[PDB]
Amino acid sequence: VLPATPPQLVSPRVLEVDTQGTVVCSLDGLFPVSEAQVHLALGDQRLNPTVTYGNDSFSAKASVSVTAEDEGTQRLTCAVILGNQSQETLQTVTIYSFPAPNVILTKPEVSEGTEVTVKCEAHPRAKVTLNGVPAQPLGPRAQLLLKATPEDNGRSFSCSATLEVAGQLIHKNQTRELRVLYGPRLDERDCPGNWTWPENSQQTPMCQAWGNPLPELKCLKDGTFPLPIGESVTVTRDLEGTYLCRARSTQGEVTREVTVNVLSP
Template sequence: MLQLLCVLLASAAAAAAAQEAQEQPFVSAWPENPVVEFGSSLVLNCSTNCKNIRDGGLETNLDKKDEGEGPTWKAFRLFNVSNWDSAPSCYFDCGEDVDMKPHRVNFTVYRVPELVELDPVPVMEVGKNYTLTCRVSSMAPIRNLSVAFLQGGKRLHLQTFEKHAAREASDVVVTHIVTAHQADRGEEISCHAALDLRPEGQLFGQASLNQSLETVDFPVNPQLRPLRYMEVNTSETVTCEVTGVFPAEEAQFEMTFAEERLNLSVTVVGDVARAQAQVSSSIAGSHTLKCTVSLGPVTKTAEENVNVYCLPDLVLTLSPQETFVNEAVEVACYDAHPEATQSPPFSAHIRNSRGVLESRDSLPFRVSVTTTEEDDGQEFTCQVDTEIDGRPIRRKTSSSLTVFYGPQMNDSSCPGALTWKADSKEAFRCSAWGNPPPTVECRKHDVPYAIGMPQLVTKDHQGSYNCSASNWLGSVAKLVVVNVESDEPPTLLIILVILSLASLASAAGVGYYMYYKGHKCGKYRLPRKAKGNPSEEKHLNGSIQTDSV
């Protein structure tokens, strides 16, 4: 009886405590232990059993938005959950007499592994130990991760991380040592990563690509094709070859140049395996080309030194680059990176269109020239010549000079006299040269005349034209005389010809009259005819005089 009484009293006390607890104000959240993916959003509901709520909300450093509310609850949407240690707190104010403690919400922010990768498994020699490496990139929380190695569908090794306390995402590397057996040849091996967020979340799994285990033999040495010289920042093809291997298609090549790994292309013909790669270097000097070929545990290497040469990085300067006629200009040639240059002996030249101005066997050097009008636009060149393995090598750079000078004219550009035919089409041409190019203007009787425009020639075009050319350095002037020739005879000439003809006609008339008077007018004796007619004789001798015997 005493024992039963004790049980009843304990039950009553527990019931009273439970009722009192139910009547105590509290704050809760749903979901209680939310699981959310990094960078996504979540709706969180804060609630209370308080009857007289003055205020309530959610304290968080995340972006939030009200999603609704009721008499005893408020809902919020949290955006871009990207804080690994985020712990929002729900709170409510039920008055001064009620002590309402905020409710802290424990978040689990996760990130599914981006990549699960098994490091390349080398060709194994039977009886030797090899380390398998599995890499799981950028996932969280690591305490919920497990990584397993599988071979032929069987689990070799399982690793968990329950004691990992950090919440943020990071990479995980898991290794496992295996001993190679002859029976392993051809079996598939892989690693699997599992992120278990249950019961609140899901189970995520991801596996690496399968790799096949192999065992082989390798009894030969690799051979490198000779490569003695190479210019900096150029590319050359190198070849590494092995013969007599089995199986040749399983030979693994690695080539490095100046301690940098090269990308290879491998071909196999029979028992010959060959790897090719492109090599280049931006640093002059002697660099090591190395080829390593592996089959299982056997590794063989071939090395060769390659001389990388660098010709000067030429720079040509003109000081000044813009100047005037009869001024001195310094032409300088130098190496932009003398500290990086390693080259065989060379000869350097500064030249222009007239020929070589200066030659040296080292840099820098310079030469001075005095400018003329012909130097405007002149190209100066710095050139380096050398020889590598009997092959001529040349590098050069150029720069142009600008020379300013005043306008110039001559009879070729602006003739002093022009002869045009009337009724033909002619264009008045007058030009000048200078730098800057001058402006040319021609005027007749102080009126501008169009230059270069064909026009029908009339007598009005005849006369003198004042032409001038100018730029900001000065001006020159020239007189151009235009003569217009006409095919029609001049009026004065016609009048003179008519007067001359009239004078000639008058003179001829007077002469004829005088001649007639002196020779045709006077007495004539006609022979007498027998039995002549007196009247006829009278008519022949005239009516005034009659012959007398």
């Protein structure tokens, strides 16, 4: 006999396009179970469930792929016929298409001090937020103007979008880094302009240039007398004088004067 209890159907309330779902349908208290036919289907698509049997029951588990042709509210159904009687369970499932938000930069690599604008568009009904702006999502697209600076090189611009589907919030996000080229710099902290060393002492002159791309460095006095940056040298009277340090890269050129003063013993 087939009981008056309908089958239990377990399935997610929503399912994304081009993704695989999992549906399981079960019923206890029916016999003979071998004579029972289980028909599992999502809308028009007849599913193929691998059925586990007991002496008095069945458990039908089935995967279900969905495409753009399934988009919308489909009906997941699980019918069980046992001779003359029949029990079926219905459940709605919404197949939704929700692409990832498109964070779009005017130019991927920009020069320093340039007006860069970062946009993020998404699904019309969805609501987006660009690096937490606006706080609490409102409308499907957001902007952000910025004066490009060296600190913005490698700066990520994340966009979070939320889409309401069948009474629940689905979340997605996208992230894109900005590349910012910035001219050479000889900053004082990594290249001081004044040394004072005792004669015949071991010293290492220090000077690093900043820039994207990495600048090439060269410090010369009296024409072509190189200051050995990074090397540990014996300080002599020959090293005394004012050097002209020059940083070089595709973004420009900078100079800094570095004086070396030798104290006689």
